[PDB]
Design a protein around this nucleic acid. Sequence first.
RNA 1: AAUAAAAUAUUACUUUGGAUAGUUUAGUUUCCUGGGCGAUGAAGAACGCAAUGAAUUGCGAUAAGUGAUAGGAACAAUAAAAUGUGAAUAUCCAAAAUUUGAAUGCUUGAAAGUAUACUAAGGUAUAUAUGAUAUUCAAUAUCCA
Length: 56
Amino acid sequence: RYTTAFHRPATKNAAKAPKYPRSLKANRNKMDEFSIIKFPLATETALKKIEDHNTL
RNA sequence: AAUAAAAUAUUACUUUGGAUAGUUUAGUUUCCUGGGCGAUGAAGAACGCAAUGAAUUGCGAUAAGUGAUAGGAACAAUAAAAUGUGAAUAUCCAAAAUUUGAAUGCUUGAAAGUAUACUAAGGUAUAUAUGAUAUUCAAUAUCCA
């Protein structure tokens, strides 16, 4: 057989086929464009950068 | 020999202190009933959410609260709004339930993270041991062609 080592023979590996769903959690993303951004920084220091650097 | 500043003595009032008296939404013991947790994720820890909160309390990205059922007019420190077309309040109920934790894909120091499969992001599954069934295999281990 030209090889001394004896490994575990390869067998069939069926994919997971659960008979009922694991979780019924609703498919709604809680991180959207509204929850991500709380509010702009309205301080005087943060208001200086808008005019020149064009940064919010 | 002499004065009463100091010193001493009693009473009244004031002061420092908090005893004594009155009081209790706090405890101690005995007895009665139960002794009802968790992979459907427990107990514990962390972080976060009130119009103005630091703690505490309640709660979990639906945040000092949502729906349903009872409940009937409030709350209050200050404004506001909503309100018998239903305010507070209550519940063995329903929806929801962040990071961890037996903690369980892999790693975890105070570590930021990260692989595959299924349904770019999001959400599930994948630890160890283990009972049953299906299935693919290994061993000339016993025969046998």
